[PDB]
Every structure is written in C-alpha cells, then in structure tokens.
Amino acid sequence: GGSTRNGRDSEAKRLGVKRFGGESVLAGSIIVRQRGTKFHAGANVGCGRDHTLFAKADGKVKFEVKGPKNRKFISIEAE
Amino acid sequence: GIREKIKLVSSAGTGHFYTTTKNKRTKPEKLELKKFDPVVRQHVIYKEAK
Amino acid sequence: PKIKTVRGAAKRFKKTGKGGFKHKHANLRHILTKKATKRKRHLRPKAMVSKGDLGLVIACLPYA
Amino acid sequence: GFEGGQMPLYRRLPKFGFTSRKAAITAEIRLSDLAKVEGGVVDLNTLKAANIIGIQIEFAKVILAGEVTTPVTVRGLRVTKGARAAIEAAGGKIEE
RNA sequence: CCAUAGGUUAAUGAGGCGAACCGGGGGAACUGAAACAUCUAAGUACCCCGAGGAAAAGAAAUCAACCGAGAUUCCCCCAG
RNA sequence: UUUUGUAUAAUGGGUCAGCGACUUAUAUUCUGUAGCAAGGUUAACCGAAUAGGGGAGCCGAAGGGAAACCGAGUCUUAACU
C-alpha cells in the first residue's frame, strides 16, 4: 500500500577506469548528479549537461586529486 | 496544462516557422523574438504567439 | 503456391547493397513541438535493421 | 514476424511510400553491351530486339560496365559522362 | 347487342429418371484475425431451376498511347 | 509418461499376433554435389515425345535516392566538408 515503484538502470559511474584506450570521447565517468565526485580536468573536460565527464583528445586517463580539499578531477593525457 | 502550443512564424515571405508553448492565461500578448530562417538563410523576426 | 509477401512489412523496408534493409525512424511523425530538434534531426535519415530482428524481416519479405 | 505478443517490428516503424511508376519503363544498359547490340547504332530500341532491354522500356542509360572495344554510335539514348568518355575512347558517338 | 369469359372435341408437345462437368436463382458457420464486430472462411458447403455433349462466352460504345493492336475461349509469363 | 523429484500408494498397459503417427504438392532460403560461367536457364507449346526445337521470360554482372534523377558513385545540405 503506497510502497513500491523504482527508477531503473541509469548506470552513471566509471566506464573508463584509469588509463584506457581513451578515444576521441569515451566517458571514463558518467556518474551524473555529480560535479565534484569527478571534476572536469586535463586534456579532456566536457562535463556535459548530465555532468558526464567527457574525455576529449585520445590518450590515457589519469584520475587525480589536485586541488584544495580533495576534489577528484579526472584528466586524460595522451598515450 | 493551461499551456497552449504556440507557433512562431517568419516575417519573411517564406512559410518556414518554429514551435513552442505559452501561458496565454497570463500572457495574452503575441510573442516575437527573432530566430534563424533556413529558407532565407538569415536571422529574422518571428511572430505569432497568442 | 507462391509465398505471399507481408505487404505491411514490405512498405517499411528496402533491401540495400546487400543483406541490410534500412528503414525509417519512429517518433518522427507526431507530437514534435516538445522534442529536441536535434533528436529529430537525427531521425530524418534512414537506418539499417539492427541485425537482431533483421532475421524476422527476411521472412516477411520472401521475395524481397 | 509475430514478435511475441507485442507490436511487431514492421509496425513500430513508419512507412515511406511512393513508387516511380516510370522506373519500370526505364532500363540500365551496360558497357559490356553495345558490342552485342547487333551491328552499329545503339538505337532507342535495338537492344530490345537484341534481347537486353524489354518491349515495355522507354528510357535507358549507357553506363560503364568496363568494356567497349569496338567503336559504336549509340542512338536515341542517354549516357553517363563517365561512359560517354570510354565510349569515345574507342571512337564512339553520342546521339541526343 | 355484339364480344369476350367459360365449355366440348381433335392434332400435336410436356411430365419422370438420371455420375461428373455447365449456366442461372438463393446462400451458411466452424475457422483465421492467436479475443471480436469491419474483414476471413467464401460466393465455398448446401438447397432450387434449366440445358448440352459440352455449357458458357464471342465479332469492340475493346485495348493502346499519338506507334499501333484487333471477337470469345484455354495454357505459360507478366507477379505475390 | 510427466516432473525439482517417482519403487512410488501419480499416468498408461490382462497377454499375444496384425495395423498405428513428421507425409505430399507448389514456393522460398541455406548446406552438400554436378553442369556451365560474367553468364546460367528455359515456360507453355511443337515434337522425328525422356531428344531436338522454343530464351516469352526469371536470376546475376550497380548502386544511391522518397522519387525526378544521377551512377562507381549517390544521398544528405547552401555547402567545399
């Protein structure tokens, strides 16, 4: 009674954990809702509407911490 | 609802047009705002919006 | 007796350079005002059959 | 095509109709031909009597198939600018 | 009144059987649509009348497409 | 036999002998095999009838486009991308 329902999939997480093939624009992190769980940085950025961490130019993924008070900050150099 | 589907028209002699909605209930003033007209390939004034 | 082709189906498909049939996208002929022009701008072009249900298509059009 | 019980695939997908009703009377000649058009001058017809067009046809294109060799002069027909070349490459001739 | 109607006679012909095929009059439902009304089954089954060795059809108020073809009927294609 | 599971107290059979159920026609798609090959093949019909004749026609050598059209390109678009 009045108890049930539920959203659905909405994966939103790391799909390009650490270094990877890193194509012109994979994802490496689609953890929506977030902006601080994974901050836009490095050769890549994007951070689309749903905050999905873009991932520009091809290369390797990094996953840093640089910046006052934690602050993840995903960056991707060239591999 | 209360939001009618409004349609913006080009001031140009072309039939091209845009589409959206408006709250006529409180905005009985026909809207205009200028948009791109593919036909004339030039940004012009678009009108009609209850 | 010659196999009859599923008319309704042969009106939404069209064999391509090979196996594929390529069809028409849906959600592009009704209530559009509230649809991203982009979304639709990516619906106008034709698209091949998903290769998953394609098998069925190549059954409704025996003479395709 | 009885997709379980749900809406079939040949259903959820729109239908883009319309049929030439003219392409049926339009043939497609190939460069490999002509050399077998029985003699010279590839008349608007000829190929018909040369079994390679169709008594119903009315329009046709020369098109390149990768052959020509013998000099031929197509008549009462069309041809691609890529064929009206290889055709002349062997002393051809366009009607029009 | 005429005249018809009706009556008698005679000469002819019909009647009833029939297997299929044939023309015509009337005409289902199960079934399929994974339900069911449109639709399908099917102008089928079935009933009725009529005729022949065949029946029916047939010498364009037909097609064609600006070239032309030339009654009807049956076969193969066109084409699922 | 059906079941997650049956010695099962779940189904079927008294026994024997004979009969008893994936066929056939046309179509379409693969696989194998044979013929020929950018060509392969005839239908009806004729018939000196399994020949031979008949290529009406079907399939393939060209595709893209909704089509007009164009064509190893073509659509999309003003468009060069």
Next chain:
RNA sequence: AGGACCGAACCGACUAAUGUUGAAAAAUUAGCGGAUGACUUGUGGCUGGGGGUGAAAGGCCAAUCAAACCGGGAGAUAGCUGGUUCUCCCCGAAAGCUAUUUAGGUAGCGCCUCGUGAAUUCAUCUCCGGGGGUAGAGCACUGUUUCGGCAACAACCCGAUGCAAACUGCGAAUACCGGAGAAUGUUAUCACGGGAGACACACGGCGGGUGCUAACGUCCGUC
C-alpha cells in the same frame, strides 16, 4: 344433486424393505392416493427444432433435451492431455533477461550444436595503474540514546556511554576495469551464417529481504 363419502375394476405413485453384475436400463412385496370426474381408455388425426407442447419441472417432444435424431460443411478449432517404432559414434543446453489480454504460449537476446573466417584473441598466476563506500569501526553530520554541567520541569550547548538499510569526518578483505610478463590450455576467444531446445527448476554453502534469523516456506545475488 354433488370436481360429495367408504371401496374393487381402472388411473396414480406417499412410505419402507428387497433388489443395485436385478426377474427388471425404475420393478417386486406390504401398506398408500383418486375412483361420475379438470375422470379413465381404444382407434385414427394435427402441432417439428431456436420450433412444438407445457394446471410451469426447463418438464416432455421414441430408454436422448438449457435446443431431438440422420446426413453433410468436416480431417471445425484444440497455445491442452496422451502417443511417436532400427543401431552406433561426437558435442551437448535451459529452467534467465526483456516484451507480451502475458504468466504451464510465444518472440529478440542469453546458454547448445554445425559450418566459415579472425588476431598471440581468451583464461589462470605475477607485477603495475585505477575508481569504490560494502564488512568493520566511529558519532562531526542526519536521527536516536543514556549520565552528569546552568536553567520561576526541561531544548541548546560542555564532558562521559551506546544505536542505524534509507548516518558517515573513517575504511578493508575483494570483486571489477585496464597495462605488461612467463608457462600451461588438442581457439579455450570474437564475428557471421544452417538447426535448436529452453524461458515450471530443487537442494546444499555464503551475503541478504520477507517469515517467528519458523517451515523440505517464499524472493534476489553467488558457487
């Protein structure tokens, strides 16, 4: 005189027993009701099926009736039940997901088989690079909870003790993703194409919701 009384024939059928592979597909026996009446009976006739007939039970219409019997449409349909016949050899599932007037049926995917291609593909162990908020712990935060410290009986706050799936200022094992390496593995791996079956699972271990940390209970994950 009387749809009057008692009572045989005659008509009927309230009770019990017996019969129940009967003597009998409704009877026998002992009682029982009407018996000049809407009585009872012979003979012949008329009502025909969605129709008849009916002092009305859906009763009767040939041992048949909420639509007779015979023949035909007809091999109706049957996602259901049953049954499916000689031998050997290789491989070998599923009882899941997602849809479905769908739930014991189906269809795409997944798992089987067979064929054709493909790169040092795929697996384990080692080392490197990764994000992680579970277990646990903790109580700043969200709530909750004690005990002290002032409150014309107590918040707040201070210190001291705990509790949490929807608490977290902490935080594993580990799983997973990627990179490189050796060995081993009769390509194990991927794509495509011919044939599927299967979408009732059961128990035991571990982590759990539900249940009574009940059930050979129920519902997921995983082996």
Next chain:
RNA sequence: GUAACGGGGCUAAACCAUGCACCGAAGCUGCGGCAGCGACGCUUAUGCGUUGUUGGGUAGGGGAGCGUUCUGUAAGCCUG
C-alpha cells in the same frame, strides 16, 4: 513393537592427544582391445607401430550405418 548406536554387543568396541599398519571406488596404476584429434617413427597415395590425449549425458545439433517392400542391373543367378 524393542524403535533417539543399523543390529549384536562394547567400560572401552566411548572420548582427547600422538603415531604407524591395513581395508576401502567404475578415482589412480598395470595388461589386453576399440573410436576421435596431435607428435614421431616413419614410411610416405596408401598405410600401420609407438606415444600424447579425449570418449557420463535429458532437450537438442552433427556424422555414420542395419534391415523390410517395390524398379533397374535380370531372357542373369539360386531353385522340385
């Protein structure tokens, strides 16, 4: 109906710890034999000897076969 060691029966035939011996399966080994894939020897069409390894199996997929009736090979062969 003994019915809460399977029974008999056991004070150790119970239990704790230590250690050795043995029994025990279609597991593993040995010997002989069969089929599939890989290697050798070889010898090489062929082809086998040795060796490595594989061979539970419902739905179901794949590959090989046996036999029954009728046609040709049949005016042949077997046959009183």
Next chain:
RNA sequence: GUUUAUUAAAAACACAGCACUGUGCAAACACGAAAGUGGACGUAUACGGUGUGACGCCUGCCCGGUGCCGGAAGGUUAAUU
C-alpha cells in the same frame, strides 16, 4: 385437481373469486415473407394480457427515478429541396 417419465407431490402450478389494462370488429392479439387462419360463424354481460389466488375484515403515505397515459405551445431534430 397438477407437476420434476427414472431421487423433489410440496409451502410449488392450477383453480373459482378479485383488480388493472388493451380491444368498435377486416377487434386487440397470435401463426404466416403472402394468400390465408385461429380469435369467433363470437361482437364490450365479449375476447386477449398481466398480477392476486375461496371466504371474512381490509388493502395506508410517496408520481421524486422508470415505465405507461394525455398535452405539444416552444427548443433540438432524418430523409428531402
């Protein structure tokens, strides 16, 4: 008195009586595509339908809803033009 022939004989059906209602006769109604026929060679003290069910004392209040009866002035309104 009647009834479930073959598990129910009854408190069930039937009945005389009552009431409502239809019917002016080519009656209403019913069988029948129709002709025709029953009603009835009857004619409102007659015939059909429905409910109640001897007889006695009785049978109250509600017409809002539904049906039926009457009115139809006006509003809406088919084919047709």
Next chain:
RNA sequence: AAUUCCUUGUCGGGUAAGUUCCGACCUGCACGAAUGGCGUAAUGAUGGCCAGGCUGUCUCCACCCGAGACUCAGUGAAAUUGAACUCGCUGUGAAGAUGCAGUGUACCCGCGGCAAGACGGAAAGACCCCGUGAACCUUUACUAUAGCUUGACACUGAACAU
C-alpha cells in the same frame, strides 16, 4: 415468525430434566397490506409438537418355519489384470511401504467366514483454478436486426377557400 444475526433472547405452560413445541413480551439484525396484511370452518400420502392404545423400535436378545448360504451331480458367467517367489514392526523415502534399511516372525496347500490395508474395483473430479474453450440465461454491456412507428417521393387525380 417458512422473516431474529445476538439466540438455547426473557417470562409463562408442558417434563424428573424440553437448543424442539404452545401462550406471551417487542429490542422487527433485516414483517407489512393484491411480487397482497391479518384471520378462517372444511379439506391434506403436507411441516412441527403432545398423548392414549400398541407393540422386539429399544433394555437384550431366544427359539421356530421357510428361500439361499454349505455338500454332490449337470450347465456355467463378471468386474479386474505391468510382472510376482503378494508377512509384522520401527525407520527411510515424491513427505501414510509386501517390494528400501534394520530387526522380528514364518513347514507346503486348501475349505468356510469377516472386511482393517492393497491410498482395493467403478467414472481422464462434478468442488477449486486454468483456457485470450463452450453453451444457454440477464440487462440502462456493445454492435446489429424482425416487429411497431415518423416523414419524403412514387402508385397519386379534379376543383375551391385562406
């Protein structure tokens, strides 16, 4: 109460004792006036209760006469039936065992008797659920339709008034 759930209501009568019965009360779960209310002589193979007579209905059976039953001679069925070398107990087990484990017991075969088990025989459960099954039935379910009925035109004309 053929209507009352509470309900064996409460009271009275009958009994030695009465969830029934009869007479009352009224708190009518949820009577009620022609889908008639309340009475009613007579009638009834009608429902309930009481009594007198009567008795094997019973306490509690006993004997007796016949038809079978049993024996002999003649004739001669049936359902059922996977195969049988067809014991008890306790446990096990697809969860209530002749067939499994353990144990106990038991010379082989008939005849007459009884029915506790063979989840005995009999009928592809009638209850229950399921099937995008069936049939009749109802209705302001839907869609149609005979019949009834409305008007227009046709068969269908001549005049006058307004």
Next chain:
RNA sequence: CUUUAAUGUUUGAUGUUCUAACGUUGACCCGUAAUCCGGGUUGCGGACAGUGUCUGGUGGGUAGUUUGACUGGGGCGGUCUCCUCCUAAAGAGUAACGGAGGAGCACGAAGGUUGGCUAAUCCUGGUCGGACAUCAGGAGGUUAGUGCAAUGGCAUAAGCCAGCUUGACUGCGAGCGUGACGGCGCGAGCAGGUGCGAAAGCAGGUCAUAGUGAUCCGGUGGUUCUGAAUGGAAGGGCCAUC
C-alpha cells in the same frame, strides 16, 4: 429599379368538396345446382387507407460477441507507465502484495550572456518592534538557498541582483554510454548565420536525473519529387506540424 400593396400567374402550407384511380371481410348477376376465385351492377369509403424505396424513433423479441492480468489458490482489496533512496553483497545490473516519497508539469523568464553580490542561526545595542518587520556591530560558517520528491551537486557558485538579449538557432557530427529490439542519452568539433562581452570566451534552454504514447488513419502549411493518352488537377511522396 428598389421599401412597400390589388390583378393574373406560379408554387409551398394546411382545410374543405368531388370521382376517376385505390379499398370494401356490404348487396345483387353471371361463370356455376361454389362458401374460394374472376368478370359485371350497385352502395360505402376515396386520393385517404395500403404498399415499394428512402428516412428519424423505438427495439433483449432475436442474433453475434466482449466483459484484462499480477495475485503466496480464486475473489475482495491493491497494483499496472515514469522519477529518487534503501534492499544490492564498496564496477554495471538483479526479486517480492519488501520499506519510504514523488511525476503526467512550471518558466519569453525561472532561458543566454556580461557585471556584481553571499547566507541560516544566535549574542549585544537600537522609535513605534514585541518570539521574530527594518538598522548597527560581533560570533558563526555551504547549519542557508536550489520552482516541485529524493539522491547526488553547487562559492570559479548550479544560490541572489541588475544591464543587454533570444543559442529554447539551421544543417551535420569524431567518438562514446545504455538497451533483445523499437529506441534513449552524452557529445568535441565543422558550415551558415546570431546574442552577450574590451577580450580570452560562453550560448544548440533550465544544477542533473520524472513531467510521457509507438503504428495506422487522416487535418494544416511548404515543395515545379510524382501524377495512368498529353497539359493541368485530384491523389501520393518529401519537410514542418496537429
């Protein structure tokens, strides 16, 4: 010629009367020593009635069907699509009639950009001002705020204020995520043109995740795509859209 009235006329509306269709289950005659039927005569009725086609109403009298599923048996109740959290075992994903709460929209500004700003709460002091209106100072530090649930996020603010605007643009799209599929989501960059800014640059709707409906059949605008002898047209396609 109109705005309007007698004459004729045409025509509709009823209302009368007539006969001659039409009816007669009145009376005779003949067929005929018949009750049917037919013809004739007469009476009554009379363009009515009745019938055919069409048409509105009525129509369980009859007919064909429909009348969902999940469900700790069925029914009743509840549920059926979408979003948020827990269950979910630290990648994704996972069930129950498990525990909780929301969506079916709202904004021409609540969008874009440029420039600027920063809370809640308490303490102290202050006209009417008190529990809390506005003012001042201090502590405090995302405990505020966020159009609406929840989770995540937000100070370089995604929070607040103002100026200028319409990028809530058109065509495309490297490449990815997520689905059995139909789909759905993210998207740098390219071309055309815009807006804001001195400029670098930002802008393809809102802090993000709900605010939704496939196909068919059509409706509206556009288009030299098609258009059955030809030119048109109807109709069809295409793009936009209801």
